[PDB]
Amino acid sequence: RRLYWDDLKRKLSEKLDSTDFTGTIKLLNENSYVPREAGSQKDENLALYVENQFREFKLSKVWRDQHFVKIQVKDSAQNSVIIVDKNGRLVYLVENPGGYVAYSKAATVTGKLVHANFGTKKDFEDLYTPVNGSIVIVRAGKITFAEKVANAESLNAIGVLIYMDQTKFPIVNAELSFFGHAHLGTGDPYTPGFPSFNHTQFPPSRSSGLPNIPVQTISRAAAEKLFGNMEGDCPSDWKTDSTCRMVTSESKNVKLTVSNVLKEIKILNIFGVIKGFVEPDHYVVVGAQRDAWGPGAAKSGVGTALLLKLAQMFSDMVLKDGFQPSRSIIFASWSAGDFGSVGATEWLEGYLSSLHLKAFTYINLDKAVLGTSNFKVSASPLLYTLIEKTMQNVKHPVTGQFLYQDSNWASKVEKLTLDNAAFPFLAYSGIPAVSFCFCEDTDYPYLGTTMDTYKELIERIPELNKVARAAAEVAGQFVIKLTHDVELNLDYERYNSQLLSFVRDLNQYRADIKEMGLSLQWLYSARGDFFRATSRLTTDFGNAEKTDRFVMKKLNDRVMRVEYHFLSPYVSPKESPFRHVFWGSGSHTLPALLENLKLRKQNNGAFNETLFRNQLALATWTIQGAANALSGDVWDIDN
Amino acid sequence: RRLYWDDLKRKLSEKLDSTDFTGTIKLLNENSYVPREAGSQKDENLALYVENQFREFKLSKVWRDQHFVKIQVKDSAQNSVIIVDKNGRLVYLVENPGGYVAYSKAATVTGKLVHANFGTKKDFEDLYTPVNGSIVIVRAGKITFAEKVANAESLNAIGVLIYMDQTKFPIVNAELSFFGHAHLGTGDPYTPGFPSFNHTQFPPSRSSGLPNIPVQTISRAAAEKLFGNMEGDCPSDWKTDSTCRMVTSESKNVKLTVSNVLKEIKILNIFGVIKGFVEPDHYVVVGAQRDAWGPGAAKSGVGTALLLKLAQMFSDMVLKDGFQPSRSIIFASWSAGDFGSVGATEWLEGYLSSLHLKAFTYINLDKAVLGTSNFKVSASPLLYTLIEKTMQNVKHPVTGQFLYQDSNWASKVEKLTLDNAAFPFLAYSGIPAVSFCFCEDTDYPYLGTTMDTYKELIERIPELNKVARAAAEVAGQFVIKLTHDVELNLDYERYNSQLLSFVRDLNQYRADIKEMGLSLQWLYSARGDFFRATSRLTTDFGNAEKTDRFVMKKLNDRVMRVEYHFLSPYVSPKESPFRHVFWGSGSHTLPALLENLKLRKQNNGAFNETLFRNQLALATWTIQGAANALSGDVWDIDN
DNA sequence: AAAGGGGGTGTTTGTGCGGTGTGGAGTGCG
DNA sequence: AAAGGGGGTGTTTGTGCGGTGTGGAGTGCG
Ligand SMILES: *[C@@H]1O[C@H](CO)[C@@H](O[C@@H]2O[C@H](CO)[C@@H](O)[C@H](O)[C@H]2NC(C)=O)[C@H](O)[C@H]1NC(C)=O
Ligand SMILES: *[C@@H]1O[C@H](CO)[C@@H](O[C@@H]2O[C@H](CO)[C@@H](O)[C@H](O)[C@H]2NC(C)=O)[C@H](O)[C@H]1NC(C)=O
Ligand SMILES: *[C@@H]1O[C@H](CO)[C@@H](O[C@@H]2O[C@H](CO)[C@@H](O)[C@H](O)[C@H]2NC(C)=O)[C@H](O)[C@H]1NC(C)=O
Ligand SMILES: *[C@@H]1O[C@H](CO)[C@@H](O[C@@H]2O[C@H](CO)[C@@H](O)[C@H](O)[C@H]2NC(C)=O)[C@H](O)[C@H]1NC(C)=O
Ligand SMILES: *[C@@H]1O[C@H](CO)[C@@H](O)[C@H](O)[C@H]1NC(C)=O
Ligand SMILES: *[C@@H]1O[C@H](CO)[C@@H](O)[C@H](O)[C@H]1NC(C)=O
């Protein structure tokens, strides 16, 4: 190898030092590209610009991907929130919101309005007033809109109102309207599990994650108007405004009118590839959402700029600096990401067989520059060692210190959530995924609104160029170290900590497990067997000669199957897309098993004996099968 | 390569010429090994003998596999079939059968007895007397017992009686009792989809294929006694005995008492491996059922003898003749095969992650010598070219002619059925599977009875040694050509015929498809795309250098994914184990789509519009995704 | 009979071929 | 207090360690 890690890192750094990220973001926030709603003309214009840029970079191949998806848009009739008397007579209009929640059911609901803090399950459980047959008003944040709506609907609430409170969203003007989607999932909600291509002819199907109650986003002024008609006083545990109130007066009601209409649109996914020199059929996917409801400077402008600049720099290094990737690099520009990563999920569903054990890592650039105080990572454990090594190399954009300051950062990593485009890659496809951001201690206030302009981003983050340079540096080092080395730099040994944590959590209910005719010895043995398999694999890697391309291919295939073997092989990928037992959603996951067992502990009566027994069996054998497959040949398994 | 195909074929032939198959079968039918019911002491003794033989052959590794499965056995109380009056009073006992149907519901049912020909759906549809609230009596054969019971149960019959008629089973004595199982599936019916290991702790689960009505096998004398109390005359279209009758007299009823009890038993799967010299992690599995209800000479003795002799010959060639397999060879001795390939299916479920894309072919030796007139093959299309090449080489055991006599043999190959141990490998695991037999035009009469002794086999098939030698020759040539060549000898191009046949069958309902807002252009394009992918792969194989181990590994992996890509990625592997869209069972298969569309054509009212639309979408995209994955890299797909 | 349709084969993938009235490769009939 | 239990850590996978009353690696208390 003419270029080693040090020389290639230096080349990446000197490419970054002469890159104008601020100019690219400013160009992406031009009037020719905003507003940039999914399937619009501006979205298609930016897709064509991205495609022409990928062609200008002289990538190995540039190709398009058209999907026809169903999304919700505002009707000609305006959604309205209205205070009505006990007899339904008009009192006074509250607000005709400018924003809306996509995939909210188009319906009119009237009833009492009661306040939940954030819509989390703890907020609903610890709430004095029962939320049934009543509209719940929740504050935006701490969970996705879909989670809030699902939690409210599971308690038989007839509607949801969402607003951004002053404390958590210190926006100066209270009339600002924002956008979200209430689909508890990813992709097109009307083509669950299948690619939504013309080939399917779009059969009548409907995802179970679609809400059945109206959902509406209202401005802070509208929320204060509603609180003016309420009585209860919010608890101090909710660090919210003093104007916030709990329950509507007994002589008033709220009529929520939602009339969003489904629209079928064409979304483009733009791809470019830098084909590898040793193993081109294996690749790292680098993706960034392109669409945005408003201007989307931080929502999609920063990610698209990072994608374009990374593609340019990597093409320059491969073509001019002599960089020779062993694997390929795919640069993906997703569309319809504001509706739940629709483009990425439909691409994953369309090409699942082609991406199976070929794409071994997804890097998400969405909202990578969102602030400057903290560097936050949510990723698969396989990427923890790579992230730690990158953090020890990349300096902080503002302070001269390296990003690696906390030795225990890995124990504070948040699980990937539905709002992240890396979640479909990890939980559904079993491809290790990483999402990182430079963020503050608080959520970005303008994210998802009409004030998410480039001017606001450059005002909130002066020296945005350096922060974007640092984000592109960590992403480029990810790509280089995942693609140039003879080893994949995926740490299968990091799942030993995950299994230990699961065993420790499950040991809290040993009395409950002993009350049933069950035992934890099989899960203990599975944890030990997985550790032994990882140690065997590390010994094999150490013994193998690096120049021997065959044995290293075998070992790298064993490493690539690690994340796939944690997808549940017992649930329907159509009904339960997120089959990952660690990071997926559904009763097949380990957290669901722990939740069911905790329900048994509380003696609430909602515990399901048979469901828990099946969960324990399937989880135990999923872990044991992952260990067995990682160990080696079928005859080498101990039992 | 010191040894080429000709020299190695000659070595195999000269090893076979000095092999005593008759002696091995006679030894396996000794009193120390019969009767050999699953989980019994004789079954364990034969498992230990097989393990000691594998160790004596000096195979690379010999290992065991213990499963604890639930099977049905006869109670202390005898099952009885009784003729009763209209008031339920005893008339006279018909028979206390010596055999039974495993997994039949233990219940007592009384009602009218009506005759269906074989229990096939056509037999029930074309039957004058409605079979509801009545016991149906069917002839054994032409479909599995489970299929008969499911067909009867779907029409609300309260019980099933099975007998072997004189015409189809020319057994001299009419008192012979036989055995079967009524589980519409494979594996342990009480651990559906999961390995049934101690790790699962055996949660409360139940397969949907278990019948809910009593099922009993009765002797021919008992059936004639029952027909003596019947009135109707069977149609001449049923080529059955003249004694057969249709419907019970109006003044008589049949009381069927079944009291089978579940028993948990330990079954052993004995394995031996001959590790390859180039790609040991990939292997061909050669399997044979060991257990049998009776003596099981043809049911399990012949297959086990063939397995032992093949293992001996291949170990001798690898150790003494210099044969150097590129891949490995696994010799598997399954147990509990009489209950629906329980051992093989539980092994597949236990090690699904380890066998995934590692086992690329399963060869089934069960009932390979069952006669001498015909050579019958049921296999995956990927193995059709290998089977044809083997047939052109192997001479017929009796006549000097080669096995390949009919040029159109491939169009007459029967689909693998539930009674075959290769069916779980093909339909569930996506591993190409082959089952062959030397059989007559009629079913083996003693198969599954207490007269399936070695004496009957040697009387019915004189020169059994030569027929067993020919069966071992075709199996050994299968193993050699699948394992020695640098190419896998799997013909992906044979699925072009399957897709053409599917398109031709679907073209019969173009008017019905046009009546709905549907089109077949996507399936036509999928067929063409799959052909283009296969042609591209053949061109790549021709261009690639054989000595280049890396590119050939890549191409062979592309070939190995072919059968796996035809498993439906949209159904639950637990609820629908047989996910193969061609050879599986369920609404996800292409035959199910055709059946639904035919239901639309008949205007019966049972057609499901939404189900058919989803079926068409999912089948179209399964075929298109298989084509896309076979074509190559994701960027090389045309659209 | 005459102008246009559905139903048709089966390797050169072919899904076309609707305009001519049989024929691309294979092939009908109102 | 004394003999035996459930609950406990967290790399040397550790699932053990129940008999001693704290300790394997880490570590309580009736
Ligand atoms: C694929 O399906 C989409 C719709 O799902 C088709 O697009 C529509 O085409 C009709 C007729 O041309 C137009 O009236 C609609 O406005 C289109 N919808 C959109 C969202 O553009 C498309 O034509 C289909 N493609 C193919 C090749 O059949
Ligand atoms: C507990 O979970 C089991 C599933 O493990 C539920 O049983 C299922 O019930 C549905 C109908 O509601 C059936 O279609 C399934 O076949 C059942 N599965 C099994 C394995 O029994 C059961 O209903 C749950 N209990 C409660 C109280 O919700
Ligand atoms: C695995 O489970 C089986 C039963 O499913 C256990 O075997 C039973 O063990 C009990 C107690 O030793 C005996 O009374 C039964 O007769 C056994 N059943 C059979 C069919 O043999 C077995 O002990 C379990 N293995 C482990 C290691 O726990
Ligand atoms: C036709 O098939 C559909 C499935 O494609 C059936 O609809 C399902 O009905 C069950 C309850 O019976 C629900 O749990 C499923 O969610 C439904 N699925 C869908 C996609 O709708 C439908 O019932 C069938 N029709 C008939 C008459 O049997
Ligand atoms: C909520 O449930 C309680 C208990 O059944 C019921 O009394 C109450 O009326 C319900 N709420 C509404 C708005 O009906
Ligand atoms: C079978 O169904 C028909 C139609 O409902 C009914 O009349 C008849 O009684 C049923 N058979 C029995 C044995 O009840």
Ligand SMILES: [Mg+2]
């Ligand atoms: Mg036509």
Ligand SMILES: [Mg+2]
């Ligand atoms: Mg012609």
Ligand SMILES: [Mg+2]
């Ligand atoms: Mg303990």
Ligand SMILES: [Mg+2]
């Ligand atoms: Mg210590």
